Amino acid sequence: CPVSSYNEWDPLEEVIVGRAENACVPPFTIEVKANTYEKYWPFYQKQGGHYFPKDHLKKAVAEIEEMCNILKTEGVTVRRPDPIDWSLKYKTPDFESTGLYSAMPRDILIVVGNEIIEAPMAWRSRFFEYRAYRSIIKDYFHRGAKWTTAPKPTMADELYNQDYPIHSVEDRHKLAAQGKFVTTEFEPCFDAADFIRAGRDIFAQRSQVTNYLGIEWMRRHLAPDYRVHIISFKDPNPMHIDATFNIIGPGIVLSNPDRPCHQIDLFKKAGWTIITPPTPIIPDDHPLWMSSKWLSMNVLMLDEKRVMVDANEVPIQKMFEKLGITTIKVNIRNANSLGGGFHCWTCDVRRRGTLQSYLD
């Protein structure tokens, strides 16, 4: 029973850690544009289809190897996806594209109990991302784990709002208010990172890449043992929930100050502790091609009292320390450029614990 994880904090025993090798800038299509900060459009426009800066990839490779050494030191068994050249152009009857990477296991895999679920994805450059993880998943399957792949979308034009106000407009907030994003409700789609686990309760957010159809598929697939709840935040470009509402312990959550939860009272009524982390100190000149600066709160819990946090983000380190949580500092400044922190770069396969309710 290699697979067994019910939440984000029980004693970590096994984890999968992504790879920065052969990562490619994704073609600049509507859904990529919707996620990209104006500051990087020219980069995407000129680099699409080519590898991310190799000198940069080399620094990320080194940073992740160290993180892996540290995880092993902390007693965690580490598995890595297979190396793949993401520049291969593939063609389905609906579209043609080059790949992205297998840097973020959290984006595509989620473990609920003894079951590993592969998310369908919503980006054309991520259609075949599951190929990097099949060697690991087949091994767990041979060893007794449940293996599920949610319905893979066609990703035909109909899935995208070709006329979304990507070009900047901010009333994306207005559409967002209506739960309307770059992805339509044409077919189910979602990134696993839009779901965060707390035992019997899983919280999901409708985002640029996760539609209500996708959430309903998860809800229906997991019922009645698990309850999937939808929550929303003030955010004009949501993609993944773990840098917005990161649950770090039973009844404790890190809420991004810039992205308040519309349903925060549900948690306050449940006796939950909402902690708002201090702002990130990452320089504005450092390239974050795929995300915001909020990767600082994208921490990974080794257990309730041990957290893997960025070495450079001292303010948030102090915060954890005042709470009695031991900080294991690792530097992943260059890996952050690819779009993720510790929670994103990993997928907890096995945590020592049982299925419980923390919402009463």
Ligand X SMILES: CCC[C@H](N)C(=O)O
Residues that bind ligand X (CB under 6 A): 239-240, 242-243, 291-292, 294, 298, 340, 344
Identified catalytic residue from 189, 344, 347, 348:
344
Spatial strand order of the sheet with 12-17 comes to 77-79, 12-17, 346-351
Compute the distance between CA of residue 106 and CA of residue 133 in angstroms, rounded to an integer: 12
Compute the distance between CA of residue 188 and CA of residue 100 in angstroms, rounded to an integer: 21
x/- track of binding to a second copy for residues 232-261 (CB under 8 A):
-------------------x----------
Encoded tokens for 118: 């592969």
Compute the distance between CA of residue 211 and CA of residue 207 in angstroms, rounded to an integer: 7
| Count of positions (residues) in the chain | 360
Q: With CB cut-offs between 5 and 8 Å by kind, which of a second copy, ligand X, none does residue 87 bind?
A: a second copy
Query: Minimum Å distance from CB 65 to a second copy?
Result: 4
Q: Does the protein bind a second copy through residue 323 (CB under 8 A)?
A: yes
Cβ atoms of 192 and 106 closer than 8 Å: yes
Q: Which residue, 13 or 235, has its beta carbon nearer to ligand X?
A: 235
Cβ atoms of 94 and 154 closer than 8 Å: yes
Compute the distance between CA of residue 359 and CA of residue 199 in angstroms, rounded to an integer: 9
Identified catalytic residue from 191, 201, 235, 310:
191
Q: Please confirm, yes or no, whether 284 is among the known catalytic residues.
A: no
Q: Please confirm, yes or no, whether 191 is among the known catalytic residues.
A: yes
The amino acid at residue 48 is: G
Q: Does the protein bind a second copy through residue 78 (CB under 8 A)?
A: no
Q: Say whether 259 counts as a known binding-site residue.
A: yes
Compute how many other C-beta atoms are within 10 angstroms of the C-beta atom of residue 231: 18
Compute the distance between CA of residue 142 and CA of residue 116 in angstroms, rounded to an integer: 13
Compute the distance between CA of residue 336 and CA of residue 89 in angstroms, rounded to an integer: 26
Residues 262-286: b if buried by 16+ CB within 10 A, e if exposed: eebeebeeeebeeeebebbebeeee
Residues that bind a second copy (rule: CB under 8 A) add up to a total of: 30
Query: Minimum Å distance from CB 263 to a second copy?
Result: 14
Near a second copy by CB under 8 A: residue from 43, 49, 59, 229: 59
Q: Say whether 292 counts as a known binding-site residue.
A: yes
Query: Minimum Å distance from CB 323 to a second copy?
Result: 5
Q: With CB cut-offs between 5 and 8 Å by kind, which of ligand X, a second copy, none does residue 292 bind?
A: ligand X
From the list 158-166, 225-233, 262-270, 294-302, the region that binds a second copy by CB under 8 A is 262-270
Q: Say whether 157 counts as a known binding-site residue.
A: no
Q: Which residue, 103 or 132, has its beta carbon nearer to ligand X?
A: 103
Would you tell me which residues interact with a second copy (CB under 8 A)?
A: 21-22, 57-62, 65-66, 69, 82-85, 87-88, 251, 265, 268-273, 275, 322-325
- Residue numbers in the known binding site are 107, 242, 259, 291-292
Residues recognised as catalytic: 191, 240, 344
